[PDB]
Amino acid sequence: MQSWYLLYCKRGQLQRAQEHLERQAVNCLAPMITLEKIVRGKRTAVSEPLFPNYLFVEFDPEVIHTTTINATRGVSHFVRFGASPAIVPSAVIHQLSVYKPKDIVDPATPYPGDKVIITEGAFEGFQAIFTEPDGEARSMLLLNLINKEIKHSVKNTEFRKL
Amino acid sequence: ETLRVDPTNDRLSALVEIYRMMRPGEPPTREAAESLFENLFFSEDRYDLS
Amino acid sequence: PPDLRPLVPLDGGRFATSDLNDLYRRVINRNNRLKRLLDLAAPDIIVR
RNA sequence: UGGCGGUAGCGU
DNA sequence: GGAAGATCGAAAAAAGCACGCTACCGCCCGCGTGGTGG
DNA sequence: CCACCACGCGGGCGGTAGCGTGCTTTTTTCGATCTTCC
């Protein structure tokens, strides 16, 4: 009788919504993947939810009504196609359970030997090659001069991705 | 004549119909319908005749 | 063109964003999110 | 020194 | 004698609601998150 | 160690629901009869 639903949650409130739904005694699921991020200047590895702002909740409407899940202090709404809320088949849940990926993540790609555009500092608007993360604050690029490119480490916030 | 037109013939059917009319797009359940009807009119929280 | 949706200065360090700029920002954000989601091979329900 | 939303007012 | 055209009223959705002018008020993304100075 | 000056991703807002609510005219659709037949 228990069934699965897709839930769209508010921005930056997935953990609180998940805790509340656990307090509602319903099953919760959200993919979790760790990776390196810029983190406003510190290229550190943290865990972000795959398919952000999406939760998969297993429960029974007869036991606990849908509107209770809708207004559980952190749930933006139900992902609904038509009048009734959408029902996700168990095959998708089974696939997501064994879903163990490895991805690069596009906007956090200061990878070694990768093209990066510097738009600040003495090398503003210049294309260079990230080649190794020097510590955390000041990543290291082959800064491009008119003659050639030279090893140099400058602040992470100076350059963005091409 | 209105009773003849009315298709519902029981309290549960009437509650389901009024719940569907009040909140479309949600699964009609007896508990939710009865709670909605009770809280709509006979509850002091959001209904209050001055 | 930008001049048809200008950001008039507010002489207070802020700018008055027009509704067109906000709508374009919404469209750009949603398009980027959809591209990222389809790049990650999201399930059918999420993609829809 | 640019826009709107609300309010009030003038002439019809 | 059941299916397709008629129609028929009943309901639902869209667009409009004068012109100039003047003055004041309020705002010009909000919010969870973060770093820094008193 | 606590108040307050940025900040950068989302979107109805807020809440373990509900909020709406004193117009007229024109156009479109739809259930319900109907009706008319092949």
Side-chain angles (χ1 to χ4, degrees), chain C residues 8-24:
Chain C
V8 295
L10 263 194
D11 61 76
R14 321 200 48 182
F15 292 97
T17 79
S18 310
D19 290 16
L20 285 187
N21 301 298
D22 302 348
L23 294 177
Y24 274 127

Side-chain angles (χ1 to χ4, degrees), chain A residues 8 11 24 68 70 72-75:
Chain A
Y8 196 101
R11 171 206 40 150
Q24 318 304 100
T68 286
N70 184 314
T72 322
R73 260 161 297 278
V75 173

